[PDB]
């Protein structure tokens, strides 16, 4: 769950209580990772760990 | 280099963190972890994949 | 054929993974993250209604 | 891809017209593409019954 509102990640300090991750439903981090991989790495090779 | 590069102070490379608690509705599976970053070591979150 | 039947050519193209790009640059080129516009006064100090 | 993803529904014909006023400071450009409604899921909700 990346860009959903209800279920989301809350990575923060244990006593900090203020979340360091914000997601506002306009960011598309899935497409972000897709394009990032497509530009940084050659995509004709299959890497078994992360499909 | 032969100094000030590696610790040789008996520290681990990989760490397995089990969730402190987990809740699972029949649509989402939420896991909560608390990862302790040593006392002196640092890590980049390019690691720490969910298994 | 010697006994052909006329002609009526029709052309088309087929993009299959491409996002059409219209960069907000005066000469349409990418000369940096910030563009020629965007940091201009007309587009940074005044509000505009896009249509 | 640093951008604000906006999905505007399209009735199965013709044209469309988006967006109200804004400031447009440090703007970078427009990227545009067409997707099918049957295939695009719901974004905000944790689930998509439709």
């Amino acid at each position: 769950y990346y860009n959903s509102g209800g279920n989301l990640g809350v990575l923060a300090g244990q006593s900090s209580q203020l979340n360091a991750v914000v997601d506002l439903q306009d960011r598309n981090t899935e497409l972000s990772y897709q394009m990032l991989l497509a530009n940084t790495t050659d995509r004709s090779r299959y890497f078994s760990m992360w499909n | 280099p032969t100094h000030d590069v590696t610790t040789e102070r008996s520290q681990r490379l990989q760490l397995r963190f089990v969730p402190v608690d987990r809740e699972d509705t029949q649509y989402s599976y939420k896991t909560r972890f608390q990862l302790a970053v040593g006392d002196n070591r640092v890590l980049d979150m390019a690691s720490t994949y969910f298994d | 054929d010697p006994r052909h039947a006329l002609r009526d050519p029709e052309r088309k193209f087929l993009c299959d993974r491409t996002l059409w790009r219209i960069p907000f640059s005066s000469n349409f080129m990418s000369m940096g993250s910030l563009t020629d516009l965007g940091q201009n006064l007309l587009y940074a100090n005044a509000a505009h209604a896009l249509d | 891809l640093s951008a604000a993803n906006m999905l505007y529904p399209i009735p199965p014909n013709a044209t469309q017209l988006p967006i109200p006023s804004r400031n447009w400071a440090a703007f970078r450009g427009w990227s545009l593409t067409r997707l099918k409604q049957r295939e695009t899921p719901a974004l905000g909700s944790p689930f998509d019954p439709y």
Binding site: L36 | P1, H3 | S33 | -
Partner: peptide
Amino acid sequence: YNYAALAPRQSGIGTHEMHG
């Protein structure tokens, strides 16, 4: 500390990857 860690003996900082 001594001038940071040694390098393997015999833009550096920053990224500007964008566009999509």
